[PDB]
Amino acid sequence: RGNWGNQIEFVLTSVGYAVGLGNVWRFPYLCYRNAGGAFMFPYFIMLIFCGIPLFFMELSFGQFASQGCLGVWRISPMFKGVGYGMMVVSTYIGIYYNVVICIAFYYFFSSMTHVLPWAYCNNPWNTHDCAGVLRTSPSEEYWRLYVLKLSDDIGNFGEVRLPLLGCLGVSWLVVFLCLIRGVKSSGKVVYFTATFPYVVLTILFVRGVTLEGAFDGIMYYLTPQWDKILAAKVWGDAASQIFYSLGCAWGGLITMASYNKFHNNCYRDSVIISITNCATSVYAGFVIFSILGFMANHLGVDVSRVADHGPGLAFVAYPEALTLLPISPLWSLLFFFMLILLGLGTQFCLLETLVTAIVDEVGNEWILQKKTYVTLGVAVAGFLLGIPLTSQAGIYWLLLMDNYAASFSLVVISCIMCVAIMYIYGHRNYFQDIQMMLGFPPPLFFQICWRFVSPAIIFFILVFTVIQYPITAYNHYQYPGWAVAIGFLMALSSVLCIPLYAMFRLCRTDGADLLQRLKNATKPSRDWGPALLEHRTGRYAP
Ligand SMILES: [Cl-]
Ligand code: NA
Ligand code: NA
Numbered sequence: 001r002g003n004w005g006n007q008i009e010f011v012l013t014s015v016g017y018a019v020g021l022g023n024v025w026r027f028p029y030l031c032y033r034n035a036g037g038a039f040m041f042p043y044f045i046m047l048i049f050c051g052i053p054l055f056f057m058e059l060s061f062g063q064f065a066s067q068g069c070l071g072v073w074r075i076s077p078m079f080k081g082v083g084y085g086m087m088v089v090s091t092y093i094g095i096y097y098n099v100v101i102c103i104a105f106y107y108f109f110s111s112m113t114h115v116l117p118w119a120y121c122n123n124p125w126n127t128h129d130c131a132g133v134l135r136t137s138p139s140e141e142y143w144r145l146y147v148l149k150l151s152d153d154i155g156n157f158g159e160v161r162l163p164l165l166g167c168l169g170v171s172w173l174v175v176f177l178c179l180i181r182g183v184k185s186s187g188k189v190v191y192f193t194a195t196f197p198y199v200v201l202t203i204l205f206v207r208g209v210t211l212e213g214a215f216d217g218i219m220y221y222l223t224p225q226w227d228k229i230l231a232a233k234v235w236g237d238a239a240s241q242i243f244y245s246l247g248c249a250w251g252g253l254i255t256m257a258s259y260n261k262f263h264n265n266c267y268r269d270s271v272i273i274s275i276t277n278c279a280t281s282v283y284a285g286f287v288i289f290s291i292l293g294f295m296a297n298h299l300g301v302d303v304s305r306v307a308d309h310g311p312g313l314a315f316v317a318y319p320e321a322l323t324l325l326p327i328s329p330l331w332s333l334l335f336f337f338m339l340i341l342l343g344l345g346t347q348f349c350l351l352e353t354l355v356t357a358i359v360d361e362v363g364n365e366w367i368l369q370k371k372t373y374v375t376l377g378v379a380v381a382g383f384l385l386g387i388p389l390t391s392q393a394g395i396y397w398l399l400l401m402d403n404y405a406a407s408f409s410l411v412v413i414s415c416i417m418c419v420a421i422m423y424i425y426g427h428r429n430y431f432q433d434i435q436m437m438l439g440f441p442p443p444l445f446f447q448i449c450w451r452f453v454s455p456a457i458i459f460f461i462l463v464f465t466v467i468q469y470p471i472t473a474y475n476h477y478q479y480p481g482w483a484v485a486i487g488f489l490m491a492l493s494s495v496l497c498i499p500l501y502a503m504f505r506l507c508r509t510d511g512a513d514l515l516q517r518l519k520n521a522t523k524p525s526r527d528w529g530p531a532l533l534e535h536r537t538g539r540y541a542p
Pocket of ligand 3 (some may be wrong): 015016017018019020021341342343344345346347
């Protein structure tokens with residue numbers, strides 16, 4: 001199989017995988033959309049009671065078998081569709097993640113001037129409604145009428161934005177060249193990629209907490225609102241954000257943990273990684289809300305109702321406030337470089353684990369010697385599939401994919417995996433496996449969580465979210481019916497992998513009754529257990 005080499009290497013690589021654009025781009029506007037501190041309490045509850053336990057379960061389940069997200073299902077061969085669903089969601093996410101990366105590239109290239117181009121209203125693309133501070137903002141109108149050239153409907157496919165296509169091509173080429181040249185084999189690139197963003201965040205924090213009005217923004221960011229928590233929308237959003245940011249049902253955690261040694265302490269690593277991820281999100285929220293409050297104080301309005309709701313918050317509200325500071329291009333360059341690094345770090349690991357899973361599934365030696373060709377094919381397919389997201393209607397499709405194809409399907413898949421492990425295989429068997437691996441049983445908190453707490457919370461959230469369903473929208477724009485249907489189909493595509501594969505596997509099982517075939521297809525295979533022979537003892541001994 002192959003080991004890692006050291007524990008700090010695995011920890012740093014997992015930090016690079018986990019902390020990305022979901023800490024600095026998606027978490028801020030998801031927190032702003034849910035009225036600040038009304039989002040924090042469900043977020044922390046869902047982190048404490050569902051996220052860390054499932055993170056630990058996934059890491060231990062990867063480490064015990066020395067198998068990836070597809071080969072670990074020898075424990076129950078009929079439930080192999082969980083890994084296929086994980087792969088489908090990974091493909092969905094990796095199509096549009098790199099489009100977000102290329103938009104960051106475009107802004108980084110545009111920041112290389114003495115004067116920022118979104119600072120004034122005296123440009124050809126500006127209208128008579130433009131009103132700057134040097135309400136229609138110059139930054140918003142730069143974003144909407146110059147960079148995107150947004151259409152009026154999702155079905156209005158206009159022209160392709162050539163600069164965005166160039167940025168997307170450059171991004172894909174960079175990722176491919178990093179993948180095929182063995183960049184991760186160097187300890188200077190991994191260290192830099194997962195450490196410099198913290199320096200940038202520290203500098204931005206120090207710059208933004210010394211401004212007049214920052215305390216008002218911080219207070220809005222941290223003050224709870226007890227009357228906006230009894231709604232299922234905020235709970236669903238918090239669950240989705242937690243699972244997306246921890247990368248639970250992506251499938252790469254199992255593949256990454258399959259390279260760990262048998263007696264490695266996987267219980268401490270999961271805690272470290274989860275705490276680091278959430279602390280990074282909170283720190284970025286501080287950084288953004290400080291100058292949100294400063295800008296609100298400048299404009300004379302409340303901390304809320306100062307910016308629009310949507311994924312463009314980091315591309316519109318932040319630079320418009322940066323424009324009011326001295327040496328603005330420096331801050332802009334730092335911000336966009338940090339975003340680019342965070343995105344590329346996650347994209348590299350996603351593609352690596354996906355290619356590894358495909359190659360392992362195919363099996364034969366012919367595909368082992370043609371791994372570069374598989375990587376090139378996957379990259380070409382990703383670029384070609386992301387091409388239509390760079391048109392005048394691209395942001396509609398991107399928002400739909402973000403909110404439907406990678407939202408709350410991860411929670412369902414993780415819950416199904418947990419239930420399958422705990423109730424078909426047996427919780428006592430898994431506890432014995434964990435004690436075999438670690439030398440002590442898992443703590444009772446995790447046992448209670450896995451057996452009772454997380455599935456019940458997920459079930460209640462699912463039920464009350466399904467009962468109360470609002471239709472997606474984007475700043476007073478109402479999506480048509482067929483777009484909502486396409487979003488539902490995208491959500492269902494990954495979930496449907498489980499029952500379909502279960503029926504396909506049942507169709508080829510021996511027996512004379514349905515119950516007999518159900519019993520035969522659910523018991524562990526002959527090769528389930530530890531990989532190495534000296535670890536093959538107790539209940540697995542020959
Ligand atoms: Cl987060
Ligand atoms: Na994250
Ligand atoms: Na990253």
